[PDB]
Design a protein around this ligand. Sequence first.
Ligand SMILES: Nc1ncnc2c1ncn2[C@@H]1O[C@H](COP(=O)(O)OP(=O)(O)O)[C@@H](O)[C@H]1O
Ligand SMILES: Nc1ncnc2c1ncn2[C@@H]1O[C@H](COP(=O)(O)OP(=O)(O)O)[C@@H](O)[C@H]1O
Ligand SMILES: [Mg+2]
Lengths: 352, 331, 496, 78, 302
Amino acid sequence: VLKWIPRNLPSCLINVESSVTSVKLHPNLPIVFVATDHGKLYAFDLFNYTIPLASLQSHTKAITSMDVLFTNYTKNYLVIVTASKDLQIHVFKWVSEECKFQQIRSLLGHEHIVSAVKIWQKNNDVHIASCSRDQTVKIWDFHNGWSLKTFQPHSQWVRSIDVLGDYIISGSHDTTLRLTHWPSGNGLSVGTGHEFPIEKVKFIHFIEDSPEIRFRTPSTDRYKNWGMQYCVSASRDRTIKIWEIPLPTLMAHRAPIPNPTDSNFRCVLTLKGHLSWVRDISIRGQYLFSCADDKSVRCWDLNTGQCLHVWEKLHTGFVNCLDLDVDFDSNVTPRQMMVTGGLDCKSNVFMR
Amino acid sequence: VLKWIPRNLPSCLINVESSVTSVKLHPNLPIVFVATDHGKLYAFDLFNYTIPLASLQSHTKAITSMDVLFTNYKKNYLVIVTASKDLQIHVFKWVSEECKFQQIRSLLGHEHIVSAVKIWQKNNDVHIASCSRDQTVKIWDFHNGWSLKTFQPHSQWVRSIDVLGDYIISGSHDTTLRLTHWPSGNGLSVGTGHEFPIEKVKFIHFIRFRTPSTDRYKNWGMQYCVSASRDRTIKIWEIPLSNFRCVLTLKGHLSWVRDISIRGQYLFSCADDKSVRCWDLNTGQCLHVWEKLHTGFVNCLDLDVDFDSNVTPRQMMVTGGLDCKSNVFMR
Amino acid sequence: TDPGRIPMSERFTRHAAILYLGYPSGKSLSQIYEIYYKAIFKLVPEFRSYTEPFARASVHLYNECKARYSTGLQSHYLFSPRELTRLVRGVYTAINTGPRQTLRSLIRLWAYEAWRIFADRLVGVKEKNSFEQLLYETVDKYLPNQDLGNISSTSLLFSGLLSLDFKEVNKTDLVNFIEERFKTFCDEELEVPMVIHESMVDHILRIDRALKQVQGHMMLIGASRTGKTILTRFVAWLNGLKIVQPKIHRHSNLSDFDMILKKAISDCSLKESRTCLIIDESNILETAFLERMNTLLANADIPDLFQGEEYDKLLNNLRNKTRSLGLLLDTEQELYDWFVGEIAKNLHVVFTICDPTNNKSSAMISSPALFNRCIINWMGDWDTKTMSQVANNMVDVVPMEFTDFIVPEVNKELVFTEPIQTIRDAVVNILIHFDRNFYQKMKVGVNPRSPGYFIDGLRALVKLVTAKYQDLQENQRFVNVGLEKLNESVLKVNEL
Amino acid sequence: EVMRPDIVIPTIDTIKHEKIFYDLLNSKRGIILCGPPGSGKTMIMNNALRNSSLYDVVGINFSKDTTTEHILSALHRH
Amino acid sequence: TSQELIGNCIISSIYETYFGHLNERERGDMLVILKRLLGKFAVKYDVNYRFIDYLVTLDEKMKWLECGLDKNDYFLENMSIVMNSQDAVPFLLDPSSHMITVISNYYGNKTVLLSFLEEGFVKRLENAVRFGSVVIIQDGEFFDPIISRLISREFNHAGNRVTVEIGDHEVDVSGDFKLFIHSCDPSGDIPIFLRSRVRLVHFVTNKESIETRIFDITLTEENAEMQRKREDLIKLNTEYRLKLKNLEKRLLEELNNELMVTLNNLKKEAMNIEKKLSESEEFFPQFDNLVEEYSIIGKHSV
Ligand SMILES: Nc1ncnc2c1ncn2[C@@H]1O[C@H](COP(=O)(O)OP(=O)(O)O)[C@@H](O)[C@H]1O
Ligand SMILES: Nc1ncnc2c1ncn2[C@@H]1O[C@H](COP(=O)(O)OP(=O)(O)O)[C@@H](O)[C@H]1O
Ligand SMILES: [Mg+2]
């Protein structure tokens, strides 16, 4: 059920007025969330995509990113976090019966434009992470609405982040990546090897059962306790890179400290083949999906390392983002659909 | 899919400055275009209808007709042609990256009040056909600006026109509505049978009359058409491939029918009786009727085109009203 | 004889044997570049039999360009076998980083390189037309191959921006890519509201070609406000270079310029950051700055910056950086030539010149260290086609066609826009005609004509037409509403 | 190897110049080369001296501001 | 009025952008050529066009004149070019150094005078940019390139604010900040970077201006009654036009929601406007007779 591959043609095509910037999928219903260059947030039904289920204008400028989350309290509901160039972040509630956006709150405090938001829940506690052009990654509490942490991990402005427990990896415009421990706020490791600003960076989580996977398994019990093996990055030099995360000086029931000899990323793999800036990356099962500004979407294997499938001329303009269902989450069923959104004021969905 | 039954109540109550003269729908967006009696052009969001998106004073007088067409060939864009009582045919394009109207050019030359406009696209050429009260119809050019030819389709004033291919059908104030060829400019047939002026006359495209009748009709591409008169009735015609036949007699409206629109087998028509009725083309009887939709009469109705593969036939239609309000029907 | 070279005392030259090395003849150049093209075409063995016609065509092109565009026309029309060597290097560089080639593709690529090497310094339009006809004659005489397209400057768009290899890109796709990249550039960098025309795309392509070469320097000559600095910054942003513009104001001397140059060199070597240094003609105030630039350009280092303690700490930093990458270097010569190799690899100097008639810019162009290394690109002033494209892209957003227009019957050569059909074409033609007449009757001479007047007039016209049309429509609507109300009132009076 | 600036295609003029250059230095005589700016003085010169088992190179590129200190320092390392 | 909108807009825009640095004869010749080009390409323009009558209101003209502007038509047109330059930084080449007082009177206490030879130039310029004061920089022949990014308007938009990099640091700009450059040497070396981007306006006195000023002086001391009458009818016609517009707005408000008195007053005002136009149609060309009479004095004076 993890070996699903989209066919050569999109299952449905969605027309929106302006350039699509971010796309997310509803983890329980066939609903696609599309945020565009006017800041307009759209909710489309997959089987009835002629008109949107909802459409709301909340930002005065272009939305740069999105992330959704279905809450799991020990009521359950969907939280949509949309960040834009108006220096603010907006947090919305999705109402299933009303089929209408109900904005919960807004988060302020970023000096310049904000480029990425990630929302995660650990145990009855939901936090919102964000990175902005004022070079400060900030995390708020979702319930409180006040800022808990801010830290500057880079010299230049950071572009993408990722969350996994209490560790954040961040890529920036200074073509370097950096892993930091969030509670301590200290840069655990730094990494170089890209020659252009980083578009997307996310962790490569673990999976339980498979025939064989090389990038989603621990090599030892120490890595199993660590909880993360490698990471994936994409940048404007038309390359994707899989980096091995080195380990820092770890102590039990204590804040981790960086290792002077083991505080540098190791570039394990370098996947090339995209003709322009690789915008977005996404990993489902054993396959890694990516898009670039070459009007194409490429599906690679983590094991072999070469491009199995190419979807060329998928958009008239650039391709801006993808979204696939999360595979490593027990509570999120990895359903068989992949959605992409491009600069030609359009989105595509591949189903079955 | 194409058999959607509109709800008995409105979904969005768009408020305009004056009485709505004509309505239009974005072929791929949930944006409506509303024309007022002051010549202003209104753009509304169908999910946030409180504030208009863009309002521009197009014409000084009241707008008599308007139509839209998304170009499909040079980036494609929406084209809005607006005609009014000022003997001026304004042309506009709606940019989505800024959400505002952009004036392209004005088509001048008519010596009287314009009646109706229609936009159809060739393989790579866009044309606009506008008819005035001087009993003359001129074929315009979108990119160039000047006319191609001028023909007189009727001895009296003409009030409606529709274009489908190389043939154009025009409905005059007299009951002798006639169809004429655009490039040839020679009349073929003229048919009467009504006692009141025709308010709307448009072709019926193939999708009882939705299919071709014979091999000659299938080769020609035109088999039947429906016209609306002021005699409170709807008449379906049959253009020969030199006198048309009459076998359909449908009525029921208490006032003059203003505009009609064919969406598949079902047909929706509006009248001046402040009511909306959907009359089936097969049974010829009204099934769904809407009462107290607006205080004033209904001026125009717009529906998605089901005859175009490049236009999505959404289950959303709008009807114009004279009570300074617009009715939007969703799902 | 030439400026820069000073006559020498006979008391010294009487002790040295004087040897005159003339230019090699046609046969010698043909043999040398036959060998060079054989070395190139070892990459593409299926076209190994075309080395002789390519070398003969290159040599004949060099001879014809030397004979036609003499120094009497312009002072910078100096040709040499160095141009042929650069042609060979460009053909090899493009063949190495390209796809599988055909004979038509090879001929078009060689013609593109010949355009970019022999005919970027040409000033006049008639000279560029003569070069285009010369390319046609050379290709017909030496490479008789059919199904070969237009060989003009704008019909040869070879670029590696759109793909992974240096191939010939479509004009429309390249224009769309450049528009999107420039929107992103304006979003992330300084905002300049530019208009993308065909000459802009061609200039972007050649600046990108020059900035991708090892030790690839530039010398952009043209009128003011023609887009030299902004295209240099955009192209260096495309290639990932770091832009350094010397902020040399009037209260500056050799200390500040030398500090800027030393910081740039230190960043290039000790940090391995590629740098594009944009030297303007207004930054070089005195001749000593020009001498420093000549030292930096002819060699790969400035020895006057590092001396004594500065030289010692520079060598210490060099040894530290060499040990950082784990290279076994111990001698001072190894550290120094690795340093100058890093400078020649990671530094690109782009010279911006606005008034070549001026004596300072004449010394700039005529300087031997700059003329023989910097790739001269005479952007010049806008022609009527570029002006028409910019004006059409600027007046297409304003409401202009509202009144009746009768198409004028004017002469064919008096219309620069596509033939007149609307009022916008007439407006564009009027603006171009008045720009030409104004610059003719102010006696500008052979000086370059900045298009700043044209662009400012277009912007002012757009704003004024917008405001005037708004006022006119408001007044017409006011009088029509009032007249309708008056008619309704008089009808109500007559009814009652 | 076309990007190497030190490569020289051996023609008959280059060999003639190399031979007369060797004969002139073997006569204990200084040499001044002259010609047009792209004639090939530096390239032929460096080819003649680099491919010789009898002569080494101490290269100085003279500029407008040149003193005898530069010449003495360049001689000092050899 | 509508059929001659684009031609008049073309003439006005070209007059603003091109003619700021020309004397009277060159302006007249270039305007004649521009009108010929408009007539060749079938674009209709007002045959009685005047730049002041098209872009300068009477209120703004009196505001300029009371601030210290000369009564010359050339100086009025130059001031119109100066204050309509919203984008390009205006450059004022005044040998008499008089327009500094005029601009200071126009902007009041907001005007701050800086110089290109002051030591504290950059810091107080940054303070003026942050505050938003109208700066006038004297000694334009010694332009300092450190403020070059202010000339080219190459700002960067940080979120909701706009910033410019001056010297070695980024400073905020204000929406009311204006920059004027002033020079007194007609032979000064204006850099090409500055000259290509500024609205160069020449407040100089020329021999064509000698002929024009000779005519003006012989008009205002030979028969000043005619000039006074012309000014009186111009002011009266403008005031009556404003009064007619106000009364028309009042009549429209009354009709939308006495009436006979308002209609009678409107008819009387319209008749008065017609009579004033009929009287002024027989007086203006007689001024041309004075132009036909005082040409020899101008020729002899030059
Ligand atoms: N399409 C265009 N191509 C070139 N220049 C343009 C274009 N559109 C506008 N410009 C003008 O070019 C100027 C920027 O050019 P710039 O490179 O600063 O000139 P310079 O060559 O003097 O450095 C802008 O001020 C603008 O007015
Ligand atoms: N025999 C040859 N082999 C290879 N290249 C040659 C030959 N003769 C001349 N050239 C070319 O002539 C040019 C002369 O360059 P250079 O020696 O630097 O000139 P100068 O000595 O005047 O500075 C070189 O670029 C070289 O490519
Ligand atoms: Mg030389």
